[PDB]
Amino acid sequence: LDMIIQFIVLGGIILSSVLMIVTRDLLVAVLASAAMSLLLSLEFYMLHAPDVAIAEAAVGAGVVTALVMYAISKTERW
Amino acid sequence: MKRALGFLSLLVIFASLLVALSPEYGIKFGVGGEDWLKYRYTDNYYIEHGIEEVGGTNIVTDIVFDYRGYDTLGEATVLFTAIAGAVALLRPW
Amino acid sequence: IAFQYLTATIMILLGIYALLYKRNLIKLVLALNLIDSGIHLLLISEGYRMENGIPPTAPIYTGYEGGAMVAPIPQALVLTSIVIGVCVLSLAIALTVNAYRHYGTLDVTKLRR
Amino acid sequence: SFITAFIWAYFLWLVLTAGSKGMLWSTQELIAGLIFASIVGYSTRNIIGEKASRFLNPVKWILFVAYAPVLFWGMVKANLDVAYRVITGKIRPGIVRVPVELENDAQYTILSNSITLTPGTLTVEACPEEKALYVHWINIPEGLEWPENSEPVSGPFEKWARRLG
Amino acid sequence: WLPFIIIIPLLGAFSMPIVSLLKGKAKEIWASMISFATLIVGIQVFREVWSKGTIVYTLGAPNPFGKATFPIRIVWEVDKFGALMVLIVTFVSFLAVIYSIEYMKHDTGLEKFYTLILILELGMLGIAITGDIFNFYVFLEIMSIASYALVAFRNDTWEGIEAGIKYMFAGSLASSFVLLGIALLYGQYGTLTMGYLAVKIAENPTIVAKVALALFIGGLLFKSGAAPVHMWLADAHPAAPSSISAMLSGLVIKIGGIYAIARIVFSIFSPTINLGTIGWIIIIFACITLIVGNAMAVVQEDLKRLLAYSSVGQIGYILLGLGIGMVAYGTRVGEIALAGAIYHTVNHALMKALLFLVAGAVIHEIGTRNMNELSGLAKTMPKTTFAFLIGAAAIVGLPPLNGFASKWLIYESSALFNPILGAIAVIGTVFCTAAYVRALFTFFGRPSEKVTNARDPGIAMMLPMIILVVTIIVMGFFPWQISDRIMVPTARALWDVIDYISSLM
Amino acid sequence: AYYLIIAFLGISVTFNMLGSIALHRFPDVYTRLHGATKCTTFGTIFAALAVITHAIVKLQATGNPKYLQMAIHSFVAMLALLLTNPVGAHAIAKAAHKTGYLPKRAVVDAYLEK
Amino acid sequence: IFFYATLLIGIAGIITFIRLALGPTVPDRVVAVDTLNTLIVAIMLLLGAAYERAIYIDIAIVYALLSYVGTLVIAKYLQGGL
Amino acid sequence: EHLEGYYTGRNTMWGLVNGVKKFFATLKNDHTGLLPDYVSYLLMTTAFILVILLLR
Amino acid sequence: DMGVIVRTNARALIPFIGIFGAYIVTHGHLTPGGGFQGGATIAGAGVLFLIAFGVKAAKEKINKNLYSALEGLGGLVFLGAAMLGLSVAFFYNILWHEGPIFNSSPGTLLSAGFLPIMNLGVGLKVFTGLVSALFALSVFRRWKS
């Protein structure tokens, strides 16, 4: 059963990366960047590595998005 | 111009690395059985004799603070210069 | 080939592709973050272990029951690498924000000497 | 107001670790709990405070249990109604102002989150000075676009949130 | 007596923000002292390694072996060639810290500056001292991060945040090829060290063992002035404070870029692969670099950009010697060139530090980068121009100075090897003579209207000049004594792999 | 006493499917947010509580603290999700109303008058 | 028994991620993330008992606190401040 | 009307200065200053060394 | 500078993040967690404080000096317990091979040699680093020059 769930997650990561690099709004790009880090954190949970999952979610959720939003506030958004 | 050759070189290095990770010519996914003592022997030593060398029942926060401690010192120095650089050039003019 | 390896390699190719044909500078910074995430995903996936009969638990030894314990070397490397990733991210954001107050646009093809 | 932050930190420490010395707490972990909850309490004592020690009164606490089933029992009738609106449902949406008659800021929170969690409603922009809320209705039945009191909007949640404070 | 090269710079760096609360000038006089002690410890470790032995060191147990038969801990190996890099990086660093007291004092926020300049000469020792393959990546990263943060320091200028972005977004890509190489070289062999990996590499060659070398060298060739990838240096030198460019043209090019290639070809990847392939792969970039670097170093009009393009053409000599030193293994011809490409690193570091500090004084005094408007500078600034005259005569090589015998070895090696590459070298050394003669004739002229109101610098901007000139004159009286006692036995212990992996055991 | 496990898992998944299915059914954003917030935050409750009944039964067979610690550290996550999700729903709803957005088929709108 | 419901929630994860792909506006796209976070919190509490090891649960309580600040930053951005 | 650096007042066979200027022109305007030039150069260098090392 | 409900839930949640972020850092021998993982979480608490209350209420509650001297003081302790066993080798862990205090049985607290001291050092470093990095961005100067 384990392989099937893992193929679902590894299918999600590629589509988030494509949607992040294609689009033209910066805000959609940061939303895709905050979805990709989550779908990578769940995979680092599936391969039995908790210590990397905590650091991955704690960096890619709370700090990266809140550091990029001041940057796109102080510059243009399109 | 140049960037067409850049993309061609990207395709070449992609195909070569894809040849590398294959189980017919190169590295192996999902090791187990006999290959665990031929390709991952050092990790077997860290699992076996890990408790009574250091103390502390975890393993990942055992080899990152006791055996390979010097790399964590280098990592902390990296973060210290990151913060010094990211504050020092963000000052008023 | 297995599938985790193939997904990580596609992530590296999309990162280096977006660093060539894209001109908005924040999108370059996100591309660098994508490359580092791809290498990390490739690096943990080669410690995973299948004994063909025993499920692979994680190596912690607080209530260890019947289970193979996967390779506890690469996770130290990945923690030490994520710290450098957030380092480079912070300094690139600082320098990019500071670059807007010297000319108006946010393009990478209008920087000459 | 060191004492409130100290108690609310140390209780969470002491419920968070309950597996040592067989099952009880420890003989040794409580001291580290004291000093770490003391650092956490002294570092944040000017934000959690300001007339916030009234929640240490034990006669409130049993009252919280008296609020526990109703918020649950109204929640079951929420999602079920959501099911009825998905399979061939009708919708009349609107944003309706509600003249709530509270004071004493924190009570405005407990009335607010119970609107967006019970039968069907949504909360937007609770203003305290104008003494009202702006609730998004999904049904708005038959000419109640400008309500007198919050009887058609919530149930009896304003009476519970007028207490607890 | 060799943990004290990492303890003292960490103790200087982690203790600077709590001694800047004295709010006066203690924030400099602590840095100068804590940088001066490292010179003493460097001299003593140089003497200890040249007395006897190839000393290994182990962090933890007294041996790198538990109840096993393969290394566990992190080991250090400081054989005869790393000792020169330890001895020469702790010298220009002192002479560039005691320099910038009078320069860089009109500017603001120089509390972060001294801790960054102390991290620079911390992440550059550990590349020399180490013998582990992953520790190399962290110590290559420290140097790169603080070198990003020292270029774009004057943030309010028009192009200080224009060189920083160009160097950042390409260096942070070139420094991830190395990490992919380490990730791809772990999972095939299984150990993470530099001595015991050369044992395991010998039995089972793989396509992994060549993939993980190709991009491995292609990454380390970006941290140099190799010929297609040399453009970041050319605009990282004019956009810098002059105390930085003296410690970036002389040192960081030839620790993270030349020493690393020499170490990871001559020690890990050389019981198995032909050296004759890697020799002809390196030697092509050595021949593009000479012409490309010294051809457009004569069309210039700027002063510091001239020195930037003259410090990328001297890298071609080092790559040519180090390239010829592989297609010929142990003989007489290909042994005197590997010996002829070590001595040129230490000479080039000394004379290029001397030649950037003087340009810093000139550009600080009158303030114009252009070299055409200022002429007759030696009428009203004599000592500075004399220092420039010695530092310009020492590059091309005149026989009373030390740049002669460092280059005669590469000449006779490339002439006895093949007679085409000698002609390439002679072309490359005609063009640099043309460049420095032209820039010399612009300085002895009639005093122009922008020069006449000028003076000399003080003492603490003049005292390093004396020590550098005395060093590279008295170093030139004895050229053929120092080329047989030190730098022939240095280069003989580079292809001496069996004693390396045997003293590890 | 195994029937509680099957019943709780069934109710949990039949409300999570109903929550995430409620996006290609409603016209406008608000109604969409009115479906996803109320359902899933409910259904996840019957996730976590269905672990607790699984835990203490295994505590009644063999006494060991790894099964006692599990129940508390699931209850804490239940409480954290409970008091952090609807505030996020408020913030996204009010941030959505500003910059445009008539709630398309609005009968009355008592917020534009300011 | 604890694996089948995980695949059943993964189906809802597919049908939720397929909303973030399209979506005519920007504020329609954030409710997909706000659903998907609580779905993944629902997943990591079921798998922590399928492996029968009780230290994984302490990840989920970490994750259910930081998606909140990730929501609030974006909402405060297009709400009007900073 | 002061003089700049002009250290040439001679022409050998007067058939070499044209080739030297045609050499310096292309090399002078190669250095554009755009970031994809940097990235494409190191990419093709890596591919060149890889292709040579696979064969011999 | 947000509404009313968000500000009171900041009042309720900031100690709930703080005590849990100390729980992870303290139990680094036993559970997953440790140095950096607990470093980022308290920084997340600081981000929630800086957003829910605003620039005005945060400017005169954060000073530059105390969040700069503690970035260094939390590093020396990392070299504090790294020079103890220097009569044998560089680290060598002399609190375990007969040290006085951190020498108990390897299941509980106080177990390993000098690991709790290093985890406290790294966590105290990372929290002050990330908070002082983000606060200096949130002020920066202005959108226009």
Contact I114, I81 (CB under 8 A): yes
I46 contacts in B (CB within 8 Å)?
none
I33 contacts in A (CB within 8 Å)?
51, 54
Token pair, residue A3, equals 């392989």
Is the torsion defined by CA of E130, E259, E195, E218 positive or negative?
Answer: positive
Query: Please, what's the largest Cα pairwise distance for chain F?
Result: 66
What is the Cα E327 distance to its own chain's centre?
A: 25
Q: Which residue numbers in chain B precede an interruption (C–N > 2.5 Å)?
A: none
CB proximity F14 to I under 8 Å:
no
Give residue A26's identity as a one-letter amino acid code: L
Contact E432, E396 (CB under 8 A): yes
Closest CA to F71 of G42, D20, D18: D18
User: What is the C-alpha to C-alpha distance for residues F78 and F64, in angstroms, rounded to an integer?
Assistant: 23
Token pair, residue C35, equals 């490359």
Q: Three-class SS of residue E278?
A: helix
Q: Point out the residue among A5, A35, A53 whose CB comes nearest to the CB of G33.
A: A35
Q: Which helix (H) or strand (E) holds E476?
A: helix E463-477
Cβ neighbour number for residue E72 with a 10 Å cutoff: 24
Contact E357, E465 (CB under 8 A): yes
Q: How many CA atoms lie within 13 A of B13 on its CB side?
A: 32
Domain ranges within chain B, ordered by starting residue: 1-93
Q: Which helix (H) or strand (E) holds D135?
A: strand D132-137
Place of tokens 């504090």: I80
CA distances from E214 to E181, E204, E492 (A): 9, 18, 26
CB proximity F90 to I under 8 Å:
yes
Contact C75, A51 (CB under 8 A): yes
**Chains E and D physically touch (3 or more Cβ atom pairs below 8 Å):** no
Q: Point out the residue among A14, A29, A50 whose CB comes nearest to the CB of C30.
A: A29
CB proximity E489 to I under 8 Å:
no
Q: Which helix (H) or strand (E) holds D97?
A: strand D94-98
User: What is the C-alpha to C-alpha distance for residues E91 and E454, in angstroms, rounded to an integer?
Assistant: 31
User: What is the C-alpha to C-alpha distance for residues E254 and E233, in angstroms, rounded to an integer?
Assistant: 13
For residue E302, list its beta bridge partners: E370
Please give, one letter per residue, the 3-state secondary structure of chain F: CCHHHHHHHHHHHHHHHHHHCCCCCCCCHHHHHHHHHHHHHHHHHHHHHHHHHHHHHHHHHCCCCCCHHHHHHHHHHHHHHHHHHHHHHHHHHHHHHCCCCCCCCCCCECCCCC
G65 contacts in F (CB within 8 Å)?
80, 84
User: What is the C-alpha to C-alpha distance for residues E153 and E156, in angstroms, rounded to an integer?
Assistant: 9
Q: Three-class SS of residue E42?
A: helix
Q: For chain E, what's the residue count?
A: 505
Closest CA to A63 of A37, A27, A24: A37
Closest CA to F103 of F31, F48, F39, F54: F31
For residue D95, list its beta bridge partners: D136, F109
- Are the Cβ atoms of G53 and C55 closer than 8 angstroms? no
User: What is the C-alpha to C-alpha distance for residues G74 and E329, in angstroms, rounded to an integer?
Assistant: 63
Closest CA to E311 of E250, E371, E258: E250
Contact C61, B59 (CB under 8 A): yes
C64 contacts in I (CB within 8 Å)?
none
User: What is the C-alpha to C-alpha distance for residues F15 and E498, in angstroms, rounded to an integer?
Assistant: 69
**Chains A and D physically touch (3 or more Cβ atom pairs below 8 Å):** no
CB proximity F84 to C under 8 Å:
no
Task: State the best of F70, F78, F87, F98 to mutate against chain I, taking most chain I CBs within 10 Å.
Answer: F87
Q: Are strands D132-137 and D123-127 parallel, antiparallel or unpaired?
A: antiparallel
User: What is the C-alpha to C-alpha distance for residues D29 and E212, in angstroms, rounded to an integer?
Assistant: 49
Resolution of the model in angstroms: 3.7
Query: Å from H36 to nearest chain C CA?
Result: 6
- Are the Cβ atoms of E174 and H42 closer than 8 angstroms? yes
Question: Cα angle at F107 between F106 and F112, to 5 degrees?
Answer: 65
Question: DSSP label at D149?
Answer: S
User: Using CB atoms and an 8 Å cut-off, which of residues 437-496 of chain E contact chain B?
Assistant: none
Experimentally determined by: cryo-EM
Cβ neighbour number for residue A41 with a 10 Å cutoff: 24
Contact A48, C58 (CB under 8 A): yes
CA distances from F110 to D98, D117, D133, D135, E502 (A): 10, 22, 11, 10, 85
Task: State the best of E172, E177, E369 to mutate against chain C, taking most chain C CBs within 10 Å.
Answer: E172
User: What is the C-alpha to C-alpha distance for residues B67 and G66, in angstroms, rounded to an integer?
Assistant: 33
Residues 6+ apart with CB under 8 A from D17: D25, D26, D29, D33, I23, I27
Task: Find the DSSP H helices in E296-342.
Answer: 304-310, 315-327
For residue E75, list its beta bridge partners: E58
- Are the Cβ atoms of I11 and D52 closer than 8 angstroms? yes
Residues 6+ apart with CB under 8 A from E314: E344, E348, E352, E395
Residues 6+ apart with CB under 8 A from E345: E254, E258, E318
Residues 6+ apart with CB under 8 A from F29: F96, F101, G25, G27, G28, G31
Q: Point out the residue among G51, G52, G55 whose CB comes nearest to the CB of C62.
A: G55
User: What is the C-alpha to C-alpha distance for residues G30 and E338, in angstroms, rounded to an integer?
Assistant: 62
- For G64, the domain range is 1-82
Neighbours, chain G (3 or more CB pairs < 8 A): A, C, F, I
CB proximity F24 to C under 8 Å:
no
Q: Are strands D94-98 and D132-137 parallel, antiparallel or unpaired?
A: antiparallel
C97 contacts in I (CB within 8 Å)?
137, 140
Count helices and strands in chain I by DSSP H and E runs: 5, 0
Q: Are strands D123-127 and D94-98 parallel, antiparallel or unpaired?
A: unpaired
CB proximity G54 to I under 8 Å:
no
Question: DSSP label at B64?
Answer: I
Closest CA to I114 of I141, I98, I95: I95
User: What is the C-alpha to C-alpha distance for residues D17 and H18, in angstroms, rounded to an integer?
Assistant: 85
User: Using CB atoms and an 8 Å cut-off, which of residues 28-87 of chain I contact chain C?
Assistant: 30-32, 36
Please give, one letter per residue, the 3-state secondary structure of B9-21: HHHHHHHHHHHHC
Contact A40, A6 (CB under 8 A): no
- Are the Cβ atoms of I111 and B56 closer than 8 angstroms? yes
Token pair, residue E282, equals 């390196």
I16 contacts in F (CB within 8 Å)?
80
- Are the Cβ atoms of B79 and I30 closer than 8 angstroms? no
Query: Å from B66 to nearest chain C CA?
Result: 12
- For F47, the domain range is 1-114
- Looking at the structure of chain A, the number of domains it has is 1
Give residue A49's identity as a one-letter amino acid code: A
Question: Cα angle at E19 between E18 and E21, to 5 degrees?
Answer: 80
Place of tokens 């009644």: F60
Calculate the dihedral angle through the C-alpha atoms of E366, E368, E369, E374, rounding to the nearest 10 degrees. -80
- Are the Cβ atoms of C98 and E169 closer than 8 angstroms? no
Q: Which residue numbers in chain F precede an interruption (C–N > 2.5 Å)?
A: none
Task: State the best of C81, C90, C102 to mutate against chain I, taking most chain I CBs within 10 Å.
Answer: C90
Contact E289, E316 (CB under 8 A): yes
Place of tokens 């700090």: A63
A66 contacts in I (CB within 8 Å)?
47, 51, 134
User: What is the C-alpha to C-alpha distance for residues F81 and F89, in angstroms, rounded to an integer?
Assistant: 12
User: What is the C-alpha to C-alpha distance for residues E11 and I72, in angstroms, rounded to an integer?
Assistant: 10
* Chain C residue at shortest CA distance from H40: C20
Please give the span between the terminal C-alpha atoms of chain B, in angstroms, as a whole number.
Answer: 41
Task: State the best of D1, D11, D12, D25 to mutate against chain I, taking most chain I CBs within 10 Å.
Answer: D12
C109 contacts in H (CB within 8 Å)?
34-35
* Chain I residue at shortest CA distance from E4: I90
Is the torsion defined by CA of D129, D135, D136, D137 positive or negative?
Answer: negative
* Chain I residue at shortest CA distance from A52: I37
B8 contacts in H (CB within 8 Å)?
47
Q: Which helix (H) or strand (E) holds B85?
A: helix B69-88
Q: For chain B, what's the residue count?
A: 93
Q: Would you put residue E374 in left (φ > 0), alpha (ψ -120 to 50) or beta?
A: beta
Please give the span between the terminal C-alpha atoms of chain A, in angstroms, as a whole number.
Answer: 44
Question: DSSP label at B35?
Answer: G
In order, the DSSP letters of H20-52 are HHHHHHHHHTT----HHHHHHHHHHHHHHHHHH
User: What is the C-alpha to C-alpha distance for residues A13 and A36, in angstroms, rounded to an integer?
Assistant: 6
User: What is the C-alpha to C-alpha distance for residues F101 and F5, in angstroms, rounded to an integer?
Assistant: 44
Neighbours, chain E (3 or more CB pairs < 8 A): B, C, H, I
- Are the Cβ atoms of C35 and E165 closer than 8 angstroms? no
- Are the Cβ atoms of A63 and I44 closer than 8 angstroms? yes
- Are the Cβ atoms of C97 and I140 closer than 8 angstroms? yes
User: What is the C-alpha to C-alpha distance for residues C46 and E187, in angstroms, rounded to an integer?
Assistant: 7
F48 contacts in G (CB within 8 Å)?
45
Contact E335, E319 (CB under 8 A): no
User: What is the C-alpha to C-alpha distance for residues E324 and E335, in angstroms, rounded to an integer?
Assistant: 9
| Interface contacts (B, H; CB < 8 Å) | 29
User: Using CB atoms and an 8 Å cut-off, which of residues 1-30 of chain E contact chain I?
Assistant: 3, 7, 10-11, 14-18, 21
In order, the DSSP letters of I23-68 are HHHH-TTTSS--HHHHHHHHHHHHHHHHHHS-HHHHHTT--TTHHH
CB proximity E155 to B under 8 Å:
yes
User: What is the C-alpha to C-alpha distance for residues E223 and E259, in angstroms, rounded to an integer?
Assistant: 11
Contact I76, E15 (CB under 8 A): yes
